[PDB]
Each structure stands twice: as C-alpha cells, then as structure tokens.
Amino acid sequence: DIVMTQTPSSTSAAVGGTVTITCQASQSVANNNYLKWYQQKRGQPPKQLIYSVSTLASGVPSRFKGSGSGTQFTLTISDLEADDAATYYCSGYFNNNIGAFGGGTKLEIKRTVAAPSVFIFPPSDEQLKSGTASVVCLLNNFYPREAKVQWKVDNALQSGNSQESVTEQDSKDSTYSLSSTLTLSKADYEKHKVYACEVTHQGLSSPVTKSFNRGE
Amino acid sequence: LFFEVD
Amino acid sequence: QSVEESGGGLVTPGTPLTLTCTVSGIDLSRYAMSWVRQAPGKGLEWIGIFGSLGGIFYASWAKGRFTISKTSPTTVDLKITSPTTEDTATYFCARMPYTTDRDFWGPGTLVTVSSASTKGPSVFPLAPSSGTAALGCLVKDYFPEPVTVSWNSGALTSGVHTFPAVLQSSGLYSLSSVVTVPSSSLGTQTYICNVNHKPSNTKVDKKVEP
Incomplete structure (x- = not known):
C-alpha cells in the first residue's frame, strides 16, 4: 500500500540546536503538495506546524521550516527550546484518496544534569x-x-x-x-x-x- | 486536480 | 471552531460500536472530516474521511472493518462493525487540512475492546511524613482506562505529576498522581485529589494530610 517512512525514529539535541526530520513517501502526494507537519504531546491531539509542504501555519514560530519535493520532505527545527520536546508526524494525502502518517519522530531536549x-x-x-x-x-x-x-x-x-x-x-x-x-x-x-x-x-x-x- | 479534501 | 468525539469506552469483542463526531463553527457542507486513531504509545493512523461532496474513503486495511457516515449537518459517525482486541486505541475526529492551517482536532476518545468488566478505582493517600514536601494519590485497581486526576478542583496545578497507568498482573490498572509543595504550606491549606473514572461512573475526592 502507501508507505511514509519517517526518520529518525528518535533523536536528541540541546536548546538552540537544530534537528532535521525526513519523510519519504512511496508515491507523490496529491497535487504535489498535500503534506503537513504535526507536533504531538502526551495526552493531547496533534498541533499543526507546516502545511502545503512549506507554508508556516498561523501562530507557529518561524524557526520551524518545511521543504521537499513530491515524495521526500524535510522538517527543520532551529533554535530549539524546551517547548519542542514532543513527537512529530508527517501527514500526507494521495491521489487514490488515501491519507497516511509517518511512524513519528520523538525528540528529547538535552539540558544540564539535574539530580532528582x-x-x-x-x-x-x-x-x-x-x-x-x-x-x-x-x-x-x-x-x-x-x-x-x-x-x-x-x-x-x-x-x-x-x-x-x-x-x-x-x-x-x-x-x-x-x-x-x-x-x-x-x-x-x-x-x-x-x-x-x-x-x-x-x-x-x-x-x-x-x-x-x-x-x- | 479537484479533491473533496483540502 | 471545535470538534468533539463521543461514544468511547469499553466494548465486547464482536459487538458493533459507533462513535460520533460533533463539530461547532465548522462547515461540513464545504469541508471534510477525517477519522484517525492511535493505540497507546504508538503512532497516528489514518482510518478514513467523509469528503466535502459526500465521498467516503477508507484506508486499504479498514474497508469492511469500518463504516463512516454523515448523520446530520454537524455530525459524522464511525461504526466499527466487529471490534477486535487490536482495535483498542484512542480515536480522533479531525478537521485536518493538508493545504491550509484551519486545523482542528477533537480531544480523542479511548475505545477498549475486551471482555473484562469495568471496575472503579480505590483511592489511597500518599501522605507527607517527617523546604520541599511531596504528597499524592494512589489510584489503584481500575478498568478500563482512563482516569482523570486534578488537585484542589483544578486550583492546584504547579508541580503536579500524574504518572501513566501500569497494567497490573491482575489485569487491572494502577496510577499515581503526586505534587510537590513548600513544607510551610502543609498545615495551612487543604490538599484534595479529584479522581474521576467515567467507565465505572466513579467520582472520588480524597483529602491527603499528614
């Protein structure tokens, strides 16, 4: 069927760093631009980041950037903050009228050692x-x-x-x-x-x- | 191409 | 602009189960609604969509197993025809555009497919014993998920940690919710944890004190 392979499965980076998430679809998305990036935290529904492959959703900081072709897409998060700790998903739609998600990417924010x-x-x-x-x-x-x-x-x-x-x-x-x-x-x-x-x-x-x- | 989805 | 699912809870394997999605401030005569699900600790999964012009589309693996329909200008249904164990998941209804930012998701409703019976929790206090003090509530032996825990009816929110539930060897769930407060505040204020378990219609308010 239709597959969206999202890598890496999980990653870590410090505040102010940069993380890059890749989504690889088995075929081109519908109209070459039905592709959105979501951010999800525990117990909540996902919150949009990018639509139309590259357009920044209203209210989302500009440090979130989306790019890609018709089958490979990239989400780049710069100037990391503590708030960015979450799991990120690519969401795509296809010409056969089928939606799909990538397997997700869990991002851990690094910080200084803190004893419990x-x-x-x-x-x-x-x-x-x-x-x-x-x-x-x-x-x-x-x-x-x-x-x-x-x-x-x-x-x-x-x-x-x-x-x-x-x-x-x-x-x-x-x-x-x-x-x-x-x-x-x-x-x-x-x-x-x-x-x-x-x-x-x-x-x-x-x-x-x-x-x-x-x-x- | 028209779709019933946006 | 909001979405809300209803009809979740515990269902017996093989018993049809219909979820309802209710929208407000969203025009279903011009925009489509999607059904998505997410098993505990796993990724989002696209189930289907009712399109703006009445087209109904399902994932390849979901055809036969689900029926999506529009029941009123503001409601869309998802009927699981013959639920199985693998259908246990949080189910979301979403206005999830791929090419706009008019994106609205419901909070999700947990569907548990199992033959076990529902059981309300027991709530026990984790009291602070002899700068900073900690206290909590043990929410023990309930089924199915989930429970909700607040502190002082929502007035207490800083330093609260509600841990995820652990499935016990007995087949029941247990969960704890703790909070840290200055030690000076212990004698001055009441501390009450509000547990609600809707599947058993249990609502317990528990005073935790030294």
Missing part, C-alpha cells in the same frame, strides 16, 4: 485495611532519564515485585519524573521492618537512600 529529589511514601492505613500494601518512591524533576531505583527491605535487594512509571519530558525545564511502586500483600509487608528506596543517578555523587520503619 527523592521521597518515600509508606502504604496508607486505608490500603492496609484492604489487605494490600504499596510502597511508593518518587524521583522528582531530574535529567537524564536513566536512573537506577532499587528496593531494600531489611537490607535485602528486591527483584520483580516493583514497577516504574515515567512522565513525558517536561516542556518547561526538560526534566522527567518517575514513580517506583513496591507491591506486596499486607502479610508479606508485615513480615519486615525497614523499607528503603535507593536511587543512583548521574546527578548524585553517591546513591541516595530514603527509608522508613514500618509502624513508626
């Missing part, structure tokens, strides 16, 4: 009443995204009973946030005393530990 602020939350009494115990560890506003979060109960390394969830990259400070939840039953929870979340990150000289004693 760590918090530990013991389970609530309301949850313990229900027979389950979830211990939550919060890494707040850090960069880069890579982090090692390990659980230690009575100083025994846990494995396979925790789960991590990560935010999108923040559009203001280009940081990420992460939650690591240790999931136990109330029984297994009451088997132990010391609960510790250990965080290793490029921003920390040595691993930070946040802990509590059950029932203190």
Whole structure:
C-alpha cells in the first residue's frame, strides 16, 4: 500500500540546536503538495506546524521550516527550546484518496544534569485495611532519564515485585519524573521492618537512600 | 486536480 | 471552531460500536472530516474521511472493518462493525487540512475492546511524613482506562505529576498522581485529589494530610 517512512525514529539535541526530520513517501502526494507537519504531546491531539509542504501555519514560530519535493520532505527545527520536546508526524494525502502518517519522530531536549529529589511514601492505613500494601518512591524533576531505583527491605535487594512509571519530558525545564511502586500483600509487608528506596543517578555523587520503619 | 479534501 | 468525539469506552469483542463526531463553527457542507486513531504509545493512523461532496474513503486495511457516515449537518459517525482486541486505541475526529492551517482536532476518545468488566478505582493517600514536601494519590485497581486526576478542583496545578497507568498482573490498572509543595504550606491549606473514572461512573475526592 502507501508507505511514509519517517526518520529518525528518535533523536536528541540541546536548546538552540537544530534537528532535521525526513519523510519519504512511496508515491507523490496529491497535487504535489498535500503534506503537513504535526507536533504531538502526551495526552493531547496533534498541533499543526507546516502545511502545503512549506507554508508556516498561523501562530507557529518561524524557526520551524518545511521543504521537499513530491515524495521526500524535510522538517527543520532551529533554535530549539524546551517547548519542542514532543513527537512529530508527517501527514500526507494521495491521489487514490488515501491519507497516511509517518511512524513519528520523538525528540528529547538535552539540558544540564539535574539530580532528582527523592521521597518515600509508606502504604496508607486505608490500603492496609484492604489487605494490600504499596510502597511508593518518587524521583522528582531530574535529567537524564536513566536512573537506577532499587528496593531494600531489611537490607535485602528486591527483584520483580516493583514497577516504574515515567512522565513525558517536561516542556518547561526538560526534566522527567518517575514513580517506583513496591507491591506486596499486607502479610508479606508485615513480615519486615525497614523499607528503603535507593536511587543512583548521574546527578548524585553517591546513591541516595530514603527509608522508613514500618509502624513508626 | 479537484479533491473533496483540502 | 471545535470538534468533539463521543461514544468511547469499553466494548465486547464482536459487538458493533459507533462513535460520533460533533463539530461547532465548522462547515461540513464545504469541508471534510477525517477519522484517525492511535493505540497507546504508538503512532497516528489514518482510518478514513467523509469528503466535502459526500465521498467516503477508507484506508486499504479498514474497508469492511469500518463504516463512516454523515448523520446530520454537524455530525459524522464511525461504526466499527466487529471490534477486535487490536482495535483498542484512542480515536480522533479531525478537521485536518493538508493545504491550509484551519486545523482542528477533537480531544480523542479511548475505545477498549475486551471482555473484562469495568471496575472503579480505590483511592489511597500518599501522605507527607517527617523546604520541599511531596504528597499524592494512589489510584489503584481500575478498568478500563482512563482516569482523570486534578488537585484542589483544578486550583492546584504547579508541580503536579500524574504518572501513566501500569497494567497490573491482575489485569487491572494502577496510577499515581503526586505534587510537590513548600513544607510551610502543609498545615495551612487543604490538599484534595479529584479522581474521576467515567467507565465505572466513579467520582472520588480524597483529602491527603499528614
């Protein structure tokens, strides 16, 4: 069928830099100019950037530029800002009355290293009443995204009973946030005393530990 | 070429 | 100039499902409407379009699986004939011109195709214990997605981080929403998280306190 190959799948660049996204269609777009560039962020619909291959959409900064032939198209983003962290899509229409999208390109904005602020939350009494115990560890506003979060109960390394969830990259400070939840039953929870979340990150000289004693 | 899409 | 989808939610595999797209300030006698979808964490996918002159066009893979129609001068339908598991996705209705900037998308509606039953969440407080303090809300064991979480009925917005949901080994979803505030503010103001899970018609307001 009709294919739009968008490269790169993902890329990174610093504020003020430049990124170049390429879209390659298997055949020429309709009227040689049915081609639009979109920017999409988590939980939102896409927001237009370029139409007619090269025309700047109203209200879009001029640092977004579109170019191309009839089958290969280029989106160039200059003078990168924090707000540009998103996933970008090419959208095309074809003479057989068919629309298509490129696979998308995820752009991460680079910034200076930011160490996380760590918090530990013991389970609530309301949850313990229900027979389950979830211990939550919060890494707040850090960069880069890579982090090692390990659980230690009575100083025994846990494995396979925790789960991590990560935010999108923040559009203001280009940081990420992460939650690591240790999931136990109330029984297994009451088997132990010391609960510790250990965080290793490029921003920390040595691993930070946040802990509590059950029932203190 | 006319289309029902713009 | 706005667009809104409706009719999303949980549907059983094989049960027909019709979504409705309602526009306001958009002239459907002169402009076309498109149906797009996006599975969680994946790219946009073109489903079809109802054209300005009544032409109806579908992706090659979508013919038979979908029916697009205009039901009124301001509404366009997308009927999924026999939903399957792979049809789970956020569905967008969009005024998406390729050669103009009069581009308007609806917020999207999540369609989950599954035989499991809907379950409202349990909301538990992540309280701050002994400069900066953190608190939150554990939104545990619900199905299907999604839930919405606000803080102080929308008045609290700075430093809020609502993490994406994780599918549990039980087949239910769990999510957390946290916020950071100055430690001085803990005794001074109330902190309430407003969770809404529409598929189960659950609405919970939870006070989180030390």
